[PDB]
Amino acid sequence: AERVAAFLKNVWAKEPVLVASFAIAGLAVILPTLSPYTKYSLMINXXXXXXXXXXXXXXXXXXXXXXXXXXXXXXXXXXX
Amino acid sequence: XXXXXXXXXXXXXXXXXXXXXXXXXXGYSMFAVGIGALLFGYWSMMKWNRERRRLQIEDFEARIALMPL
Numbered sequence A: 001a002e003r004v005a006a007f008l009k010n011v012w013a014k015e016p017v018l019v020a021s022f023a024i025a026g027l028a029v030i031l032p033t034l035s036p037y038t039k040y041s042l043m044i045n046x047x048x049x050x051x052x053x054x055x056x057x058x059x060x061x062x063x064x065x066x067x068x069x070x071x072x073x074x075x076x077x078x079x080x
Numbered sequence B: 001x002x003x004x005x006x007x008x009x010x011x012x013x014x015x016x017x018x019x020x021x022x023x024x025x026x027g028y029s030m031f032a033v034g035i036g037a038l039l040f041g042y043w044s045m046m047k048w049n050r051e052r053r054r055l056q057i058e059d060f061e062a063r064i065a066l067m068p069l
Helices: A008-013 A017-034 A038-047 B028-065
Strands: none
Touching (some): A008 A017
């Protein structure tokens, strides 16, 4: 080792708070790209309606039913 | 007989000794509790946030269900 293990312990000796400022902030960029859970959070964010539902005129349409409990469009069922 | 001030030895009080000593935390042990509290912290917090989603959709559903409003 030349700078991986040799230079890392020098930061711990003088001004040790500098280690945490690079490590914690560094992991905050790497983790949201590789972990297989980040795509689930966007799904619920799009599913939650802020505005009222809009009614469209039906003339030969697939996956569209009444407001009553029936299999239509998609409807969120991701984890309970 | 003449009486004056008397000397006492016994233990001689024990002068100049370091009474300061490290206690409880050592170094590596406290970091295992520190990150351990963080790992327990985020995991328990996000479970309530997922439980909030059950309420979140259901609360906004009231506006969609009520159109005579």
